[PDB]
């Protein structure tokens, strides 16, 4: 966005008991994802890693082992309460990377700031045959 928010580990977690689909050994060895949002009131939601939790009125922080769980929680909060959350990725060494709102306006919008990458300027079906690209390491769709 205008200024990228920084992850605060001291923000309170939502009211929830024990978890079984939560963090495995990958969290302490590889990266794990952390979703934060700002609940205006006390309400009950459903986590993608198990049953139901209650989010606190204020900042809420949750931890997941997969980015798909973070985006599932993000779209559940956006469709149900229009929450606009955001999740970071934390590596084993503590590096924090901002993932979902890269320009802060969500990928449904445009913002006229992003650069289109991995785009082919030809129509699909105009790609060359696999015989044309052989023993070269380049796929017909990568050119």
């Amino acid at each position: 966005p205008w200024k990228q928010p920084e992850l605060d580990p001291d923000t309170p977690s939502p009211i929830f008991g024990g978890s079984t689909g939560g963090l495995l050994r990958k969290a302490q060895v590889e990266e794990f994802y952390v979703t934060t949002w700002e609940s205006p009131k006390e309400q009950i939601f459903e986590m993608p890693t198990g049953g139901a939790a209650i989010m606190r009125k204020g900042p809420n922080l949750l931890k997941f082992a997969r980015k798909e769980q973070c985006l599932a929680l993000t779209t559940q909060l956006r469709t149900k309460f229009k929450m606009t959350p955001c999740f970071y990725r934390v590596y084993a060494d503590g590096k924090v990377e901002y993932l979902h709102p890269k320009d802060g306006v969500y990928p449904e919008k445009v913002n006229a700031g992003r650069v289109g990458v991995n785009q082919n300027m030809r129509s699909i079906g105009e790609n060359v045959d696999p015989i044309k690209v052989k023993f070269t390491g380049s796929q017909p769709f990568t050119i």
Binding site: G21, L24, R25, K26, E30, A65, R66, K67, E68, Q69, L71, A72, L99, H100, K102, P107, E108, K109, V110, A112, R114, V115, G116, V117, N118, Q119, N120, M121, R122, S123, I124, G125, Q139, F141, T142
Partner: protein, 80 residues
Amino acid sequence: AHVVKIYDTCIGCTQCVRACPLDVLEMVPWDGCKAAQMASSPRTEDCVGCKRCETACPTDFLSVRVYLGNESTRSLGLAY
């Protein structure tokens, strides 16, 4: 990681991004369509290959294409 390729037949309907369960696609400004939008894949290393973007594509054939290969921890959808 998998390869996500987007062609000029896209109409900028933003349906592939909404159907994406891992935030791989994005919309960038463009001039080749009426909606002045074009799909991009700046986070293709997080794609698993679920082909949900291809299901939401309204154009004939596919304006977005997912090619599998070179599976990683993120591409295999592993929580461990």
